[PDB]
Amino acid sequence: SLNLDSIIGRLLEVQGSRPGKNVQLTENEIRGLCLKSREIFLSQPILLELEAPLKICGDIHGQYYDLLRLFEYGGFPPESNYLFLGDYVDRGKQSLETICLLLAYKIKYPENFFLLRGNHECASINRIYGFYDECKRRYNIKLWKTFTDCFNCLPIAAIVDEKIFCCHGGLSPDLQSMEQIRRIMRPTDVPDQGLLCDLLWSDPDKDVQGWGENDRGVSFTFGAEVVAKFLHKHDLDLICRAHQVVEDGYEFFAKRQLVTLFSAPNYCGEFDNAGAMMSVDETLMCSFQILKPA
Numbered sequence: 353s354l355n356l357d358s359i360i361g362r363l364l365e366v367q368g369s370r371p372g373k374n375v376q377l378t379e380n381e382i383r384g385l386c387l388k389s390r391e392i393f394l395s396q397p398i399l400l401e402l403e404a405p406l407k408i409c410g411d412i413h414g415q416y417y418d419l420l421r422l423f424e425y426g427g428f429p430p431e432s433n434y435l436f437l438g439d440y441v442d443r444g445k446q447s448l449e450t451i452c453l454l455l456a457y458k459i460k461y462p463e464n465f466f467l468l469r470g471n472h473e474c475a476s477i478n479r480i481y482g483f484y485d486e487c488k489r490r491y492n493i494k495l496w497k498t499f500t501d502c503f504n505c506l507p508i509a510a511i512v513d514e515k516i517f518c519c520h521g522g523l524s525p526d527l528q529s530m531e532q533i534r535r536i537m538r539p540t541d542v543p544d545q546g547l548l549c550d551l552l553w554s555d556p557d558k559d560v561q562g563w564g565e566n567d568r569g570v571s572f573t574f575g576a577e578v579v580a581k582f583l584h585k586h587d588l589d590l591i592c593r594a595h596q597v598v599e600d601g602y603e604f605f606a607k608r609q610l611v612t613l614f615s616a617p618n619y620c621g622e623f624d625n626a627g628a629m630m631s632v633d634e635t636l637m638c639s640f641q642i643l644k645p646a
Protein backbone atom coordinates (compact mmCIF):
# COMPACT_ATOMS: atom_id res chain seq x y z
CA SER A 353 0.00 0.00 0.00
CA LEU A 354 2.86 2.41 0.83
CA ASN A 355 4.93 3.62 -2.16
CA LEU A 356 8.15 4.35 -0.24
CA ASP A 357 10.23 5.23 -3.25
CA SER A 358 7.74 7.92 -4.26
CA ILE A 359 7.77 9.30 -0.70
CA ILE A 360 11.57 9.23 -0.53
CA GLY A 361 11.81 10.80 -3.97
CA ARG A 362 9.57 13.71 -2.98
CA LEU A 363 11.53 14.20 0.27
CA LEU A 364 14.85 14.26 -1.60
CA GLU A 365 13.64 16.42 -4.55
CA VAL A 366 14.22 19.63 -2.53
CA GLN A 367 17.98 19.09 -2.35
CA GLY A 368 19.47 22.28 -3.77
CA SER A 369 16.26 24.27 -3.28
CA ARG A 370 16.17 27.44 -1.17
CA PRO A 371 16.73 25.93 2.30
CA GLY A 372 13.29 25.97 3.91
CA LYS A 373 11.20 24.63 1.00
CA ASN A 374 8.66 22.23 2.51
CA VAL A 375 7.86 18.67 1.45
CA GLN A 376 4.21 18.05 2.17
CA LEU A 377 3.32 14.36 2.09
CA THR A 378 -0.30 13.27 2.37
CA GLU A 379 -1.79 12.55 5.82
CA ASN A 380 -2.40 8.97 4.70
CA GLU A 381 1.26 8.58 3.66
CA ILE A 382 2.58 9.82 7.01
CA ARG A 383 0.11 7.56 8.90
CA GLY A 384 1.47 4.69 6.84
CA LEU A 385 5.08 5.56 7.64
CA CYS A 386 4.22 5.70 11.36
CA LEU A 387 2.30 2.47 11.39
CA LYS A 388 4.79 0.40 9.39
CA SER A 389 7.87 1.78 11.21
CA ARG A 390 6.18 1.15 14.60
CA GLU A 391 5.73 -2.53 13.66
CA ILE A 392 9.41 -2.78 12.68
CA PHE A 393 10.60 -1.09 15.90
CA LEU A 394 8.51 -3.53 17.98
CA SER A 395 9.88 -6.49 15.98
CA GLN A 396 13.50 -5.52 16.77
CA PRO A 397 15.08 -5.47 20.23
CA ILE A 398 14.81 -2.45 22.53
CA LEU A 399 18.60 -2.74 23.04
CA LEU A 400 20.03 -2.98 19.53
CA GLU A 401 23.05 -5.16 18.74
CA LEU A 402 24.80 -3.49 15.81
CA GLU A 403 27.88 -4.03 13.67
CA ALA A 404 30.47 -1.66 12.34
CA PRO A 405 31.09 0.00 10.03
CA LEU A 406 28.41 2.60 10.49
CA LYS A 407 27.78 6.36 10.78
CA ILE A 408 26.35 7.71 14.04
CA CYS A 409 24.45 10.99 14.25
CA GLY A 410 23.27 13.04 17.21
CA ASP A 411 20.48 15.58 17.50
CA ILE A 412 18.75 16.84 14.33
CA HIS A 413 15.85 18.88 15.82
CA GLY A 414 14.00 19.43 12.55
CA GLN A 415 16.97 20.90 10.66
CA TYR A 416 15.94 19.00 7.53
CA TYR A 417 18.36 20.64 5.10
CA ASP A 418 21.20 19.76 7.47
CA LEU A 419 19.97 16.14 7.57
CA LEU A 420 20.20 16.14 3.74
CA ARG A 421 23.76 17.49 4.05
CA LEU A 422 24.71 14.69 6.47
CA PHE A 423 23.45 12.14 3.96
CA GLU A 424 25.22 13.94 1.10
CA TYR A 425 28.51 13.77 3.07
CA GLY A 426 28.01 10.28 4.59
CA GLY A 427 26.23 8.54 1.69
CA PHE A 428 22.49 8.23 1.27
CA PRO A 429 21.08 5.05 2.79
CA PRO A 430 21.97 2.16 2.23
CA GLU A 431 25.40 3.30 1.01
CA SER A 432 26.34 3.57 4.65
CA ASN A 433 24.64 2.04 7.67
CA TYR A 434 23.26 4.66 10.07
CA LEU A 435 22.43 4.92 13.73
CA PHE A 436 20.68 8.12 14.93
CA LEU A 437 20.62 8.85 18.62
CA GLY A 438 17.27 10.67 18.87
CA ASP A 439 15.88 14.20 18.99
CA TYR A 440 14.52 14.29 15.48
CA VAL A 441 11.80 16.84 16.22
CA ASP A 442 11.31 20.17 18.06
CA ARG A 443 13.26 23.45 17.91
CA GLY A 444 13.83 23.44 14.14
CA LYS A 445 11.61 24.48 11.27
CA GLN A 446 11.11 21.17 9.47
CA SER A 447 10.57 18.38 11.98
CA LEU A 448 7.94 16.76 9.78
CA GLU A 449 10.26 16.34 6.79
CA THR A 450 13.01 15.14 9.11
CA ILE A 451 11.05 12.43 10.84
CA CYS A 452 9.27 11.29 7.64
CA LEU A 453 12.58 10.75 5.77
CA LEU A 454 14.01 8.86 8.77
CA LEU A 455 10.94 6.63 9.10
CA ALA A 456 10.88 5.98 5.34
CA TYR A 457 14.53 4.86 5.44
CA LYS A 458 13.81 2.65 8.47
CA ILE A 459 11.06 0.89 6.52
CA LYS A 460 13.19 0.59 3.35
CA TYR A 461 16.40 -0.58 5.10
CA PRO A 462 15.31 -1.92 8.49
CA GLU A 463 18.48 -3.98 9.12
CA ASN A 464 20.83 -1.19 7.98
CA PHE A 465 19.26 1.96 9.38
CA PHE A 466 18.48 2.53 13.05
CA LEU A 467 16.78 5.21 15.18
CA LEU A 468 16.97 5.52 18.97
CA ARG A 469 14.60 7.46 21.12
CA GLY A 470 15.55 10.92 22.33
CA ASN A 471 13.90 12.91 25.13
CA HIS A 472 12.00 14.88 22.45
CA GLU A 473 10.34 11.71 21.04
CA CYS A 474 7.81 12.13 23.83
CA ALA A 475 4.42 13.83 23.69
CA SER A 476 4.92 15.74 26.98
CA ILE A 477 8.10 17.36 25.59
CA ASN A 478 7.29 17.86 21.94
CA ARG A 479 3.98 19.47 23.03
CA ILE A 480 6.10 22.32 24.46
CA TYR A 481 9.10 22.57 22.07
CA GLY A 482 7.52 22.74 18.61
CA PHE A 483 6.37 19.47 17.10
CA TYR A 484 2.79 19.64 18.33
CA ASP A 485 2.49 23.11 16.85
CA GLU A 486 4.06 22.00 13.54
CA CYS A 487 1.64 19.04 13.34
CA LYS A 488 -1.40 21.15 14.17
CA ARG A 489 -0.43 23.74 11.57
CA ARG A 490 0.56 21.46 8.69
CA TYR A 491 -1.64 18.42 9.42
CA ASN A 492 -3.81 17.86 12.49
CA ILE A 493 -3.46 16.78 16.11
CA LYS A 494 -4.70 13.24 15.30
CA LEU A 495 -1.53 12.85 13.20
CA TRP A 496 0.51 14.17 16.15
CA LYS A 497 -0.88 11.31 18.27
CA THR A 498 -0.01 8.86 15.47
CA PHE A 499 3.60 10.13 15.70
CA THR A 500 3.47 9.71 19.52
CA ASP A 501 2.29 6.12 19.19
CA CYS A 502 5.27 5.43 16.92
CA PHE A 503 7.78 7.23 19.17
CA ASN A 504 6.55 5.18 22.13
CA CYS A 505 7.97 2.08 20.35
CA LEU A 506 11.49 3.33 19.52
CA PRO A 507 14.45 1.40 20.89
CA ILE A 508 16.40 3.15 23.63
CA ALA A 509 20.02 1.90 23.36
CA ALA A 510 22.47 0.20 21.00
CA ILE A 511 25.74 -1.66 21.45
CA VAL A 512 28.10 -1.66 18.48
CA ASP A 513 30.27 -4.78 18.25
CA GLU A 514 30.01 -5.39 22.00
CA LYS A 515 32.20 -2.30 22.60
CA ILE A 516 30.39 1.04 21.95
CA PHE A 517 27.35 1.67 24.18
CA CYS A 518 25.05 4.19 22.52
CA CYS A 519 22.10 6.09 23.96
CA HIS A 520 20.61 9.50 23.69
CA GLY A 521 21.19 10.97 27.17
CA GLY A 522 23.49 8.90 29.31
CA LEU A 523 24.01 6.51 32.15
CA SER A 524 21.59 5.75 34.98
CA PRO A 525 22.26 5.00 38.62
CA ASP A 526 19.61 2.28 38.11
CA LEU A 527 21.56 0.60 35.26
CA GLN A 528 23.31 -2.42 36.76
CA SER A 529 22.71 -4.95 33.96
CA MET A 530 21.95 -4.71 30.22
CA GLU A 531 19.12 -7.13 30.86
CA GLN A 532 17.35 -4.26 32.66
CA ILE A 533 17.15 -2.43 29.36
CA ARG A 534 16.03 -5.56 27.52
CA ARG A 535 13.22 -6.07 30.06
CA ILE A 536 11.58 -2.70 29.28
CA MET A 537 8.25 -3.28 27.53
CA ARG A 538 6.85 -1.24 24.63
CA PRO A 539 4.92 0.83 23.85
CA THR A 540 5.87 3.05 26.75
CA ASP A 541 5.95 6.78 27.52
CA VAL A 542 9.08 8.20 29.05
CA PRO A 543 8.57 8.04 32.82
CA ASP A 544 9.32 10.98 35.13
CA GLN A 545 12.16 8.98 36.76
CA GLY A 546 14.13 5.75 36.53
CA LEU A 547 16.18 3.78 34.03
CA LEU A 548 14.37 4.73 30.79
CA CYS A 549 14.20 8.38 31.85
CA ASP A 550 17.91 8.56 32.66
CA LEU A 551 18.97 6.89 29.34
CA LEU A 552 17.13 9.69 27.52
CA TRP A 553 17.96 12.61 29.87
CA SER A 554 21.19 12.34 31.89
CA ASP A 555 24.37 14.34 31.15
CA PRO A 556 28.09 13.90 31.86
CA ASP A 557 29.63 16.69 33.95
CA LYS A 558 33.32 17.53 34.46
CA ASP A 559 32.58 18.98 37.92
CA VAL A 560 30.42 16.24 39.46
CA GLN A 561 31.89 13.43 41.53
CA GLY A 562 29.53 10.48 41.18
CA TRP A 563 25.87 11.33 40.55
CA GLY A 564 24.54 14.90 40.71
CA GLU A 565 21.38 16.94 40.22
CA ASN A 566 20.57 17.75 36.61
CA ASP A 567 19.76 21.43 35.89
CA ARG A 568 17.23 20.21 33.29
CA GLY A 569 14.85 19.34 36.18
CA VAL A 570 14.91 15.69 35.15
CA SER A 571 17.34 12.86 35.83
CA PHE A 572 21.02 13.32 36.87
CA THR A 573 24.51 14.27 35.98
CA PHE A 574 27.40 11.80 36.15
CA GLY A 575 31.19 12.11 36.40
CA ALA A 576 34.20 10.56 34.69
CA GLU A 577 34.68 7.75 37.22
CA VAL A 578 31.07 6.68 36.78
CA VAL A 579 31.96 6.34 33.05
CA ALA A 580 35.26 4.56 33.78
CA LYS A 581 33.56 2.11 36.16
CA PHE A 582 30.71 1.41 33.74
CA LEU A 583 33.08 0.65 30.83
CA HIS A 584 35.24 -1.63 32.97
CA LYS A 585 32.25 -3.50 34.40
CA HIS A 586 30.63 -4.14 31.02
CA ASP A 587 33.83 -4.64 28.96
CA LEU A 588 33.04 -1.64 26.77
CA ASP A 589 35.46 0.86 25.12
CA LEU A 590 33.23 3.89 24.53
CA ILE A 591 29.95 5.54 25.44
CA CYS A 592 28.48 7.46 22.50
CA ARG A 593 25.63 9.84 23.31
CA ALA A 594 24.02 13.10 22.11
CA HIS A 595 21.55 15.45 23.90
CA GLN A 596 23.88 18.44 24.51
CA VAL A 597 24.85 21.08 21.96
CA VAL A 598 28.65 21.14 21.67
CA GLU A 599 30.64 23.75 19.74
CA ASP A 600 32.67 21.35 17.58
CA GLY A 601 29.71 19.01 16.85
CA TYR A 602 31.48 16.34 18.91
CA GLU A 603 33.15 16.43 22.27
CA PHE A 604 35.05 13.78 24.19
CA PHE A 605 34.78 13.24 27.96
CA ALA A 606 36.54 11.10 30.62
CA LYS A 607 39.84 10.56 28.76
CA ARG A 608 37.93 9.82 25.52
CA GLN A 609 35.82 7.09 27.16
CA LEU A 610 32.67 9.05 26.21
CA VAL A 611 31.77 11.19 23.17
CA THR A 612 28.86 13.58 22.71
CA LEU A 613 27.59 14.00 19.14
CA PHE A 614 25.29 16.81 18.05
CA SER A 615 24.37 16.94 14.37
CA ALA A 616 22.41 20.20 13.99
CA PRO A 617 24.74 23.12 13.13
CA ASN A 618 23.88 26.66 14.20
CA TYR A 619 21.42 25.07 16.61
CA CYS A 620 18.12 26.86 16.83
CA GLY A 621 19.57 29.75 14.95
CA GLU A 622 20.89 30.58 18.43
CA PHE A 623 24.29 28.85 18.68
CA ASP A 624 27.37 28.95 16.42
CA ASN A 625 28.08 25.22 16.78
CA ALA A 626 29.19 22.75 14.17
CA GLY A 627 27.20 19.56 13.65
CA ALA A 628 29.07 16.26 13.50
CA MET A 629 28.49 12.70 12.40
CA MET A 630 30.84 10.01 13.61
CA SER A 631 32.18 7.45 11.19
CA VAL A 632 32.99 4.10 12.91
CA ASP A 633 35.18 1.87 10.72
CA GLU A 634 35.35 -1.93 10.70
CA THR A 635 37.81 -1.95 13.62
CA LEU A 636 35.80 0.65 15.61
CA MET A 637 38.16 3.48 14.82
CA CYS A 638 36.27 6.81 14.99
CA SER A 639 36.47 9.81 12.65
CA PHE A 640 34.15 12.71 11.91
CA GLN A 641 32.24 14.35 9.14
CA ILE A 642 31.35 17.89 10.09
CA LEU A 643 28.84 20.55 9.06
CA LYS A 644 30.78 23.67 9.92
CA PRO A 645 28.86 26.64 11.29
CA ALA A 646 27.62 29.35 8.91
Ligand SMILES: CO[C@@H]([C@H](O)CC(=O)[C@@H](C)[C@@H](O)CC[C@@H](C)[C@@H]1O[C@]2(CC[C@@H](C)[C@H](CC[C@H](C)C(C)=O)O2)CC[C@@H]1C)[C@H](OC(=O)C[C@@H](O)/C(C(=O)O)=C(\C)C(=O)O)C(C)C
Pocket residue numbers: 443474476477541542543544545549566567568569570595596597
Ligand atom coordinates in the same frame (compact mmCIF):
# COMPACT_ATOMS: atom_id res chain seq x y z
C1 LIG B 1 17.52 25.57 30.37
O1 LIG B 1 17.32 24.17 30.73
C2 LIG B 1 18.06 23.22 29.83
C3 LIG B 1 17.41 23.11 28.42
O2 LIG B 1 17.56 24.36 27.70
C4 LIG B 1 15.93 22.79 28.41
C5 LIG B 1 15.59 21.35 28.78
O3 LIG B 1 16.46 20.52 29.07
C6 LIG B 1 14.10 21.00 28.80
C7 LIG B 1 13.77 19.97 27.68
C8 LIG B 1 13.72 20.47 30.18
O4 LIG B 1 14.24 21.35 31.19
C9 LIG B 1 12.19 20.42 30.30
C10 LIG B 1 11.77 19.59 31.51
C11 LIG B 1 10.32 19.85 31.96
C12 LIG B 1 9.33 19.70 30.78
C13 LIG B 1 9.94 18.90 33.12
O5 LIG B 1 8.56 19.16 33.38
C14 LIG B 1 7.95 18.37 34.37
C15 LIG B 1 6.53 18.93 34.49
C16 LIG B 1 5.70 18.69 33.20
C17 LIG B 1 5.76 17.20 32.82
C18 LIG B 1 4.92 16.89 31.56
C19 LIG B 1 7.23 16.74 32.70
C20 LIG B 1 7.47 15.26 32.37
C21 LIG B 1 8.98 14.98 32.34
C22 LIG B 1 9.24 13.51 32.00
C23 LIG B 1 10.73 13.11 32.12
C24 LIG B 1 8.79 13.28 30.56
C25 LIG B 1 7.52 12.47 30.30
O6 LIG B 1 9.45 13.74 29.63
O7 LIG B 1 7.91 16.97 33.98
C26 LIG B 1 8.69 18.50 35.71
C27 LIG B 1 10.19 18.27 35.58
C28 LIG B 1 10.80 19.06 34.41
C29 LIG B 1 11.09 20.53 34.77
C30 LIG B 1 19.59 23.54 29.62
O8 LIG B 1 20.13 22.58 28.69
C31 LIG B 1 20.88 22.97 27.65
O9 LIG B 1 21.16 24.13 27.41
C32 LIG B 1 21.37 21.85 26.70
C33 LIG B 1 21.09 22.16 25.22
O10 LIG B 1 21.53 21.03 24.45
C34 LIG B 1 19.60 22.31 24.98
C35 LIG B 1 18.70 21.08 25.20
O11 LIG B 1 17.49 21.21 25.48
O12 LIG B 1 19.25 19.97 25.11
C36 LIG B 1 19.09 23.53 24.53
C37 LIG B 1 19.95 24.76 24.29
C38 LIG B 1 17.61 23.66 24.29
O13 LIG B 1 17.15 23.25 23.20
O14 LIG B 1 16.94 24.17 25.21
C39 LIG B 1 20.69 23.23 30.66
C40 LIG B 1 21.56 24.44 30.94
C41 LIG B 1 20.18 22.54 31.92
Ligand SMILES: [Cl-]
Pocket residue numbers: 560561562563574575576577578579
Ligand atom coordinates in the same frame (compact mmCIF):
# COMPACT_ATOMS: atom_id res chain seq x y z
CL1 LIG C 1 32.60 10.46 38.98
Ligand SMILES: [Mn+2]
Pocket residue numbers: 439470471472520552594595596
Ligand atom coordinates in the same frame (compact mmCIF):
# COMPACT_ATOMS: atom_id res chain seq x y z
MN1 LIG D 1 17.91 15.38 24.12
Ligand SMILES: [Mn+2]
Pocket residue numbers: 411413439472595596
Ligand atom coordinates in the same frame (compact mmCIF):
# COMPACT_ATOMS: atom_id res chain seq x y z
MN1 LIG E 1 18.30 17.67 21.83
Ligand code: NA
Pocket residue numbers: 428429430431432433434461464465
Ligand atom coordinates in the same frame (compact mmCIF):
# COMPACT_ATOMS: atom_id res chain seq x y z
NA1 NA F 1 21.41 2.87 5.83
